[PDB]
Design an enzyme around this catalytic site. Structure first.
Site, PDB file in Angstrom:
ATOM      1  N   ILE B  19       0.172   2.572   8.074  1.00  9.07           N
ATOM      2  CA  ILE B  19       0.053   2.710   8.922  1.00  9.07           C
ATOM      3  C   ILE B  19       0.280   2.609  10.141  1.00  9.07           C
ATOM      4  O   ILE B  19      -0.722   2.660  11.304  1.00  9.07           O
ATOM      5  CB  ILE B  19      -1.063   0.632   8.917  1.00  9.07           C
ATOM      6  N   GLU B  21       3.575   4.300  12.267  1.00  6.10           N
ATOM      7  CA  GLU B  21       5.231   4.678  12.966  1.00  6.10           C
ATOM      8  C   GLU B  21       5.384   3.416  14.366  1.00  6.10           C
ATOM      9  O   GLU B  21       5.368   3.410  15.211  1.00  6.10           O
ATOM     10  CB  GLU B  21       5.898   5.685  13.308  1.00  6.10           C
ATOM     11  N   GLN B  26       9.171   1.112  10.809  1.00  4.62           N
ATOM     12  CA  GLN B  26       7.240   1.070  10.748  1.00  4.62           C
ATOM     13  C   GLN B  26       6.291  -0.327   9.187  1.00  4.62           C
ATOM     14  O   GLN B  26       7.047  -1.070   9.388  1.00  4.62           O
ATOM     15  CB  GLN B  26       7.414   2.330   8.982  1.00  4.62           C
ATOM     16  N   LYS B  42       5.405  -5.089   9.823  1.00  2.00           N
ATOM     17  CA  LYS B  42       6.411  -4.278  10.470  1.00  2.00           C
ATOM     18  C   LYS B  42       8.134  -4.691  10.008  1.00  2.00           C
ATOM     19  O   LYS B  42       8.535  -5.681  10.179  1.00  2.00           O
ATOM     20  CB  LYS B  42       6.043  -5.041  11.886  1.00  2.00           C
ATOM     21  N   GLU B 100      -1.740 -10.517  10.292  1.00  2.00           N
ATOM     22  CA  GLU B 100      -3.031 -10.618   9.491  1.00  2.00           C
ATOM     23  C   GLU B 100      -3.423  -8.859   9.565  1.00  2.00           C
ATOM     24  O   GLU B 100      -3.647  -8.438  10.839  1.00  2.00           O
ATOM     25  CB  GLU B 100      -3.876 -10.856  10.070  1.00  2.00           C
ATOM     26  N   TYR B 101      -3.918  -8.039   8.542  1.00  3.20           N
ATOM     27  CA  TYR B 101      -3.749  -6.724   8.573  1.00  3.20           C
ATOM     28  C   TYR B 101      -5.732  -6.716   9.676  1.00  3.20           C
ATOM     29  O   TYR B 101      -5.837  -7.649   9.679  1.00  3.20           O
ATOM     30  CB  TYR B 101      -4.973  -6.397   7.179  1.00  3.20           C
ATOM     31  N   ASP B 103      -8.987  -3.770  10.633  1.00  4.04           N
ATOM     32  CA  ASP B 103      -9.197  -2.847  10.038  1.00  4.04           C
ATOM     33  C   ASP B 103      -8.868  -1.784  10.837  1.00  4.04           C
ATOM     34  O   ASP B 103      -9.250  -0.285  10.030  1.00  4.04           O
ATOM     35  CB  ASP B 103     -10.963  -3.470   9.891  1.00  4.04           C
ATOM     36  N   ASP B 145       2.125  -4.293  27.515  1.00  7.32           N
ATOM     37  CA  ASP B 145       1.997  -2.588  27.497  1.00  7.32           C
ATOM     38  C   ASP B 145       0.414  -2.645  26.343  1.00  7.32           C
ATOM     39  O   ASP B 145       0.365  -3.136  25.781  1.00  7.32           O
ATOM     40  CB  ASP B 145       2.812  -2.784  26.247  1.00  7.32           C
TER      41      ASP B 145
HETATM   42  O1  LIG Z   1      -3.185  -0.098  12.591  1.00  6.74           O
HETATM   43  C1  LIG Z   1      -4.169  -1.351  12.650  1.00  6.74           C
HETATM   44  C2  LIG Z   1      -5.565  -0.582  12.169  1.00  6.74           C
HETATM   45  C3  LIG Z   1      -5.774   0.201  10.721  1.00  6.74           C
HETATM   46  N1  LIG Z   1      -5.049   1.579  11.073  1.00  6.74           N
HETATM   47  C4  LIG Z   1      -4.774   2.064  11.583  1.00  6.74           C
HETATM   48  N2  LIG Z   1      -4.367   3.705  12.285  1.00  6.74           N
HETATM   49  C5  LIG Z   1      -3.706   3.693  11.492  1.00  6.74           C
HETATM   50  C6  LIG Z   1      -3.268   4.818  11.622  1.00  6.74           C
HETATM   51  C7  LIG Z   1      -2.393   6.236   9.938  1.00  6.74           C
HETATM   52  C8  LIG Z   1      -2.817   5.575   9.142  1.00  6.74           C
HETATM   53  C9  LIG Z   1      -3.901   4.078   8.760  1.00  6.74           C
HETATM   54  C10 LIG Z   1      -4.372   3.666   9.850  1.00  6.74           C
HETATM   55  C11 LIG Z   1      -5.286   2.698   9.578  1.00  6.74           C
HETATM   56  O2  LIG Z   1      -5.383   1.575   8.313  1.00  6.74           O
HETATM   57  N3  LIG Z   1      -4.676  -2.463  11.887  1.00  6.74           N
HETATM   58  C12 LIG Z   1      -3.141  -3.456  12.199  1.00  6.74           C
HETATM   59  C13 LIG Z   1      -1.973  -2.843  13.200  1.00  6.74           C
HETATM   60  C14 LIG Z   1      -0.669  -3.959  13.250  1.00  6.74           C
HETATM   61  C15 LIG Z   1      -1.103  -4.949  12.785  1.00  6.74           C
HETATM   62 BR1  LIG Z   1       0.287  -6.297  13.320  1.00  6.74          BR
HETATM   63  C16 LIG Z   1      -1.652  -5.465  12.388  1.00  6.74           C
HETATM   64  N4  LIG Z   1      -3.170  -4.407  11.779  1.00  6.74           N
END
Ligand SMILES: O=C(CCn1cnc2ccccc2c1=O)Nc1ccc(Br)cn1
Lengths: 248, 329, 826
Positions: B19, B21, B26, B42, B100-101, B103, B145
């Site tokens: 999701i 870099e 990553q 992470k 936590e994810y 969206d 930031d």
């Molecule tokens: O990055 C997201 C939201 C969704 N998203 C955001 N950019 C993307 C770029 C490329 C491919 C997929 C995604 C993708 O699915 N959520 C997130 C971030 C850090 C933490 Br900690 C928890 N959740």
């Protein structure tokens, strides 16, 4: 949620080191030498008092989960200080900690670092972080000594004498397992209590409640004198065993 | 117990994809095998071993285990690669920070042009953001930031702040030397452009104000490539830094060095005349040049714009997901 | 980095706007037709149009208006591009030499502003004192039309009404006055303001606000004999002037939405109106002269004239001739007669101007075995829907196959000598409880027909209520003969089933070659479809049979054949199916890290995925393991319209902002993160919306036809009918052609004085980045049209590189050969 970092004095007879045949006196000695090593190296590097204490707390906790016979203490100490510097935002390069460690250690002691001192230290960080369960935030008796002293009103000279003597007792308590037995808030009260007894001061009068003879109860709830006195006994034992005497 | 971090293995997560870099490694989307919960991992790489565990991750582990707010992302745990080495010296495995994810992220929603924010959406969005920023500021932490990428948004409308890699403690008593260039230029405050290094927590407020404006235009306000041009763009809108509006501007290192083309008058209310008044006052106060005259996070929550927003009635963004597939003729 | 070349095979054919006036001479009647980036100038004869001049502009033409300020002999033209490039243009002719003069130029973009929903609006005062621009919500920009404003500098007046639907400058007012329909929470309203150049603000307008129809769409400024304005809606037409108020609500217009209006009689007595089903109306202003000598508007009447092509713009030329500029179908010249014909129509067709319409999909096939290749396109919409066969025989030969319904996807099955075309037609809920089609079309005029009997979703228990008059789409698979283009068969899908993807492939060990369609169950309640099926069909002996069906829990947006397996994108999921010996689909592996997998392309074991907001993702099939792997993802947020694979390392994408980009694997494997990064290596503003990328060429290349420096041929189709070609270059060839562009841009005079470098800069509402990795072939192919003095000026101090001779000077004649070679790719 968050880990428990306090044991009972009785539990310290069952540390990993004790069970590998190290006697209580020797582990206590190793703990003092390792803590003082951390203190001296960091003081030479100019580190903040919180950074020194955080490393010392990491050190003391580490040897509740590992044995001194398998993890050389001055390597552990150096690694703790190295991590403490990053946690407390007073960072130092590992090479600089090694340099200073050489100055303060004799050749046998610097042997613990083996053929590659920096490597032995950097490699240990992984074990340190897992051992401390990634609970990096630590509170120290210093902040409470000042938070509580700020609420005392009276002769500036008499209170400042109380604070400095108590501050010295905090620095001295880092060489002991008190950091592993009582929360920092209690330590700060205990050292205020000790300084008061030694200085013949009645702190109750400087508090907002002048007839509350148990003045510490307005800062730390649920602390019996039993505890504050066990702590005092443990602090003064260091002075009696050593050649050093109370600061007064 | 739940608290014994760093031991559980990453085997416990089915990795879905990457999701993004990140700074130290990553970021991966994953599903918990036991519970089915979607998480974000992470990766922290200690294999460089120049300085061991990176401090950016140490700050995020230290701070996010202290901060508990609905608008602050929760680190759930830390897990590791199968060490596969009896000797700890051989082990080079990495550590994963479980979160936590979420969206979506704001940049993704605005950059693709796929969302529209109504006033009531912006109210719900900004109330959560500024409430979370208040929780952090009251705990004496500076995010340092704030950008659209770092503002995560769930499909339900819940806002969470998430990149605490550059976050540090702030003392109003002991002024401490700090790292001047800490925020992205598009969202950087004028004080940090002139090099204060003694920055206040009002640096984060400026960033959120830029976002407040951006949510009403769908385009960032101060888009520039170099530090001087940004100060020029800010000055064209907010007015040139002058001792009359910012008496301590003369004390900032680059004040004589860095100067805008003119001593511009403030036009913020004119160029934003298409914004609701309650918001225009919020924007005007958040984009105040002098950080000691700029509003606090709490003051924004006690504004006509956000005071009476009820977050029980959260407002999801439009986020169309069908019939945007095929464009209408 | 990578080096690519983009050329235009067919110019945009969709008519974006048309105006009339006296532009070339104060004497001639002109017709200016605007196509995207192209301006066509015609002169109105008794038979038709006489072309006189065509120019290109480095911008999409958003505003086009003719005006004549006091002191000018003839009309001047204002054009504002979608990137906010403004200019005033003049026609000048010196005998045989025709050129276009840039009288004033400037970019009117504001640093801060919210782009409006109803788009850029530009209007000009009847006294030609100012140009009005509605670019941003809450602001009105006034360009003073004084002889001194040659930089077209302007001021913004604050507008309280944030949501404006339409605005016009009114006639017959003591001061410049605007009439605008706006929307606020209480509905829609018509309001008027006066515009003061001296005070640079609005003053209270002449006539009172009236709250108008909820779907009031257009404002007509009626000329001075009447004065005031007419407001066109969905159900009613109203006239507002001062206290005078009229309203006619004839039931005929409620049927189809009215999209355009034009003035027939300069007095204002008659106006033309058009709707989305092609119906052309006459709006009549019935006068009544009072004894005061004054003329009042008595009543309004609407009369149906006939049928035209669904028109974006209408213009009345002269006598009985009207120009029907169509965006969705062929533009037309139609004559209006006083007497109706025997069918009741007053409209008869004069000429038909080809419009490739929206190219929804396309396939390249060598139908005639000419070794060249032909392009069959899914072109047009609704009644204007057609298949268009294009071959490069010097012009393009275009055969048109009318369908009278919307084509969606096209694929070719050679075994059956036929084409499969997915189509949708509009039916309306009727009094029976069912629906009735507005006109017969391909899916209803098939020789043989079938209707799906699937019971997959038949358990329903989900209520979807129907109101009489509401529209529905009915989706079909059409089997069309490759020689006659007769509709041999038509299969109607289930109610509320959308056909989204079509492939003709053989799968597994199955000898039979099939038609495979992917569908989505669309209900007006759902945000994203949650039901869909993948159904396999066999066209055999004039009948389509249903071999197998697979239920999926989403919309199957794209399907592609993968080495005998079926690759399908169901919502966020990308799936690979195997075809069993039992003639059923069996899932092998899935990928889930997508927001919405809208586009799929393959090459070997590599898959390129196109997402709604996450740009492009390179995914690979690991046969040893039977699963998917993420090779590299682009982390720049882009909304995709089409994706293509150029070679094993370079990937081509199209943005919804009319931009193109190319991503390459970093090809430097120092870190895992570097490999998993797709680096944007080429960025380019095309100016068109690309729906489909297709590998192929229409040029003849077999038996020694000389090849070119460029390698590859990707053809792309767009909404405005433009067809284009993307090909690759060597590093040496790019730098030669790039260095030449910079030289050509200094030499060639642009219309409106628009910088070429600006025009091609990558552009979204949030970014502008200079173009990279792409050579504008149309600039290169223009070298051959510049005068000799200019050619030699271009080649001065020009040096070649990485050749047989490391540094070699260029003469004008050397480049003439190189460019002429490049004209063969298109
Ligand atoms: O990055 C997201 C939201 C969704 N998203 C955001 N950019 C993307 C770029 C490329 C491919 C997929 C995604 C993708 O699915 N959520 C997130 C971030 C850090 C933490 Br900690 C928890 N959740």
């Amino acid at each position: 949620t968050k880990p428990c970092w306090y044991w009972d004095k009785k539990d310290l007879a069952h540390t990993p080191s004790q069970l590998e045949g190290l006697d209580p006196a020797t582990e206590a000695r190793y703990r003092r030498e390792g803590a003082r090593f951390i203190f001296d190296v960091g003081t030479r590097l100019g580190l903040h008092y919180d950074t020194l204490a955080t490393g010392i707390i990491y050190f003391h906790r580490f040897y509740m989960f590992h044995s001194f016979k398998q993890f050389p203490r001055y390597v552990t100490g150096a690694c703790c200080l190295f991590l403490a510097g990053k946690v407390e935002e007073t960072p130092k390069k590992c090479k600089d900690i090694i340099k200073t460690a050489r100055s303060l250690l004799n050749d046998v002691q610097f042997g613990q670092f083996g053929d590659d001192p920096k490597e032995e230290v950097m490699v240990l960080e992984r074990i340190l972080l897992q051992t401390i369960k990634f609970d990096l935030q630590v509170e120290h008796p210093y902040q409470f000594l000042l938070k509580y002293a700020k609420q005392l009103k009276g002769d500036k000279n008499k209170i400042q004498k109380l604070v400095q003597m108590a501050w010295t007792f905090v620095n001295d308590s880092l060489c002991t397992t008190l950091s592993l037995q009582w929360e920092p808030e209690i330590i700060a009260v205990a050292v205020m209590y000790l300084a008061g007894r030694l200085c013949k001061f009645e702190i109750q009068e400087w508090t907002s409640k002048p007839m509350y003879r148990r003045w510490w109860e307005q800062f730390v709830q649920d602390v019996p004198v039993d505890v504050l006195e066990d702590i005092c006994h443990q602090i003064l034992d260091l002075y009696s065993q050593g050649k050093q005497q109370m600061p007064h | 117990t739940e608290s014994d971090w760093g031991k559980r293995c990453v085997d416990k997560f089915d990795i879905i994809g990457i999701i993004g870099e990140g700074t130290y490694g990553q970021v991966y989307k994953a599903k918990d095998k036991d519970t089915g919960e979607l998480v974000a991992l992470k990766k922290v790489r200690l294999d460089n071993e120049k300085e061991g565990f990176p401090i950016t991750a140490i700050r995020e582990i230290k701070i996010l285990r202290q901060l508990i707010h609905r608008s602050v992302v929760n680190m759930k745990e830390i897990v590791t690669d199968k060490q596969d080495a009896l000797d700890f010296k051989k082990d080079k495995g990495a550590f994963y920070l479980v979160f936590e994810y979420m969206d979506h992220d704001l940049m993704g929603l605005l950059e693709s042009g796929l969302v529209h924010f109504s006033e009531d959406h912006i109210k719900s969005f900004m109330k959560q953001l500024m409430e979370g920023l208040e929780y952090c500021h009251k705990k004496n932490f500076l995010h340092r930031d704030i950008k659209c990428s770092n503002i995560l948004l769930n499909n339900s409308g819940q806002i969470k702040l998430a990149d605490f890699g550059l976050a540090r403690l702030y003392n109003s008593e002991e002024s401490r030397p700090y790292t001047n260039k800490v925020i992205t230029l598009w969202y950087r405050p004028p004080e940090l452009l002139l090099g204060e290094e003694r920055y206040t927590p009002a640096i984060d407020v400026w960033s959120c104000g830029c976002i407040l404006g951006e949510l009403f235009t769908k385009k960032p306000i101060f888009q520039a490539n170099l530090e001087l041009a940004q100060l020029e763009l800010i000055s064209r809108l907010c007015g040139s830094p002058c001792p009359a509006v910012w008496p301590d501007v003369i004390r900032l290192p680059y004040f004589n060095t860095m100067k805008p083309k003119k001593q511009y008058r403030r036009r913020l209310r004119e160029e934003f005349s298409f914004i609701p008044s309650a918001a225009l006052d919020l924007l005007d106060h958040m984009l105040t040049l002098d950080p000691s005259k700029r509003c606090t996070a709490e003051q924004t929550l006690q504004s006509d714009f956000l005071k009476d927003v009820e977050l029980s009635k959260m407002a999801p963004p439009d986020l169309p997901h069908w019939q945007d597939c095929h464009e209408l003729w | 980095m990578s080096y690519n070349y983009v050329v235009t095979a067919q110019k945009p054919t969709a008519v974006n706007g048309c105006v009339t006036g006296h532009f070339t001479s104060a004497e001639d009647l002109n017709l200016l037709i605007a196509k995207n980036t192209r301006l066509e100038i015609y002169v109105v004869t008794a038979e038709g149009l006489r072309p006189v001049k065509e120019v290109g502009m480095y911008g999409k033409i958003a505003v086009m208006e003719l005006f004549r300020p006091k002191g000018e002999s003839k009309d001047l033209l204002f054009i504002l591009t979608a990137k906010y490039n403004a200019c005033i243009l003049e026609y000048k002719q010196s005998g045989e030499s025709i050129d276009i003069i840039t009288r004033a130029h400037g970019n009117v973009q504001d640093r801060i502003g919210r782009p409006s929903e109803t788009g850029i609006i530009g209007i000009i005062d009847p006294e030609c004192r100012m140009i009005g621009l509605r670019l941003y919500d809450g602001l009105f920009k006034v360009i003073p039309l004084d002889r001194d404003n040659k930089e077209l500098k302007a001021f913004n007046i604050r507008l309280e009404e944030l949501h404006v639907i339409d605005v016009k400058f009114l006639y017959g007012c003591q001061a410049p006055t605007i009439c605008f329909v706006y929307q606020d929470p209480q509905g829609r309203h018509v309001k008027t303001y006066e515009v003061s150049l001296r005070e640079k603000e609005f003053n209270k307008g002449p006539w009172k606000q009236e709250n108008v129809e909820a779907e009031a769409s257009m404002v007509i400024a009626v000329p001075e004999p009447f004065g005031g304005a007419i407001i066109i809606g969905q159900e009613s037409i109203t006239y507002h002037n001062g206290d005078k108020y009229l309203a006619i609500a004839p039931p005929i217009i409620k049927q189809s939405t009215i999209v355009c209006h034009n003035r027939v009689d300069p007095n204002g007595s008659r106006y033309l109106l058009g709707d989305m089903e092609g119906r052309l109306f006459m709006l009549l202003l019935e006068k009544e002269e009072q004894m005061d000598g004054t003329v009042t508007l008595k009543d309004l009447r609407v009369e149906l004239l006939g049928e035209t092509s669904i028109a974006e713009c209408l213009t009345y030329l002269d006598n009985g001739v009207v120009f029907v500029g169509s965006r969705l179908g062929d533009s037309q010249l139609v004559k209006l007669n006083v007497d109706s014909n025997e069918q009741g129509s007053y409209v008869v067709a004069m000429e038909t101007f080809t419009n490739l319409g929206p190219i929804v999909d396309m396939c390249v096939v060598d139908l005639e075995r000419q070794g060249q290749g032909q392009l069959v396109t899914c072109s047009g919409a609704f009644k204007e829907g057609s298949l268009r066969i294009i071959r490069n025989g010097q012009k393009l030969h275009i055969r048109t196959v009318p369908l009278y319904e919307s084509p969606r996807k096209i694929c070719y099955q050679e075994v059956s000598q036929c084409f499969g075309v997915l189509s949708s037609r509009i039916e309306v809920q009727d009094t029976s409880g069912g629906t009735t089609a507005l006109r017969p079309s391909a899916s209803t005029q098939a020789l043989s027909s079938s209707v799906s009997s699937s019971k997959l979703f038949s358990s329903s228990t989900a209520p979807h209520e129907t109101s009489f008059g509401e529209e529905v789409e009915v989706h079909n698979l059409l089997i069309i003969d490759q020689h006659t283009f007769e509709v041999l068969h038509a299969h109607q899908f289930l109610q509320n089933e959308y056909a989204l993807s079509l492939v003709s492939c053989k799968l597994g060990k199955d000898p039979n070659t099939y038609f495979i369609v992917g569908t989505a169950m669309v209900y007006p309640e759902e945000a994203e479809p949650k039901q869909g099926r993948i159904v396999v069909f066999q066209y055999s002996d004039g009948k389509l049979q249903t071999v197998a069906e697979k239920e999926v829990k989403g919309a199957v947006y794209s399907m592609v054949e993968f080495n005998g397996k079926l690759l399908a994108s169901i919502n966020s999921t990308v799936r690979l199916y195997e075809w069993t010996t039992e003639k059923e689909l069996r899932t092998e592996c899935n990928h889930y890290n997508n927001i919405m997998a809208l586009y799929l392309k393959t090459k070997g074991d590599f898959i390129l995925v196109g997402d709604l907001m996450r740009s492009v993702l390179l995914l690979a099939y690991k046969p040893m393991e039977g699963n998917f792997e993420e090779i590299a993802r682009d982390f720049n947020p882009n909304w995709m319209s089409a994706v293509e694979i150029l070679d094993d390392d370079n990937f081509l994408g199209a943005e919804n902002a009319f931009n193109l980009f190319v991503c390459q694997k970093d090809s430097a494997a120092t870190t895992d993160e570097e490999r998993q990064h797709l680096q944007e290596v080429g960025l380019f503003h095309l100016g068109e919306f690309v729906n489909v990328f297709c590998h192929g060429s229409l040029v003849m290349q077999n038996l020694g036809e000389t090849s070119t420096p460029t390698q590859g041929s990707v053809l792309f189709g767009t909404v405005n009918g433009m067809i284009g070609l993307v090909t690759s270059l060597s590093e040496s060839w790019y730098n030669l052609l790039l260095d030449m562009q910079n030289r050509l841009n200094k030499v060639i005079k642009s219309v409106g004085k628009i910088e070429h470098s600006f025009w091609r800069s990558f552009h979204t509402e949030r970014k502008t980045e200079p173009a990279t990795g792409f050579i504008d072939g149309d600039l290169i192919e223009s070298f051959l049209d510049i005068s000799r003095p200019k050619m030699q000026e271009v080649v001065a101090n020009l040096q070649y590189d990485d050749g047989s001779g490391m540094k070699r000077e260029a003469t004008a004649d050397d480049l003439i050969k190189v460019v002429e070679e490049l004209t063969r790719i298109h």
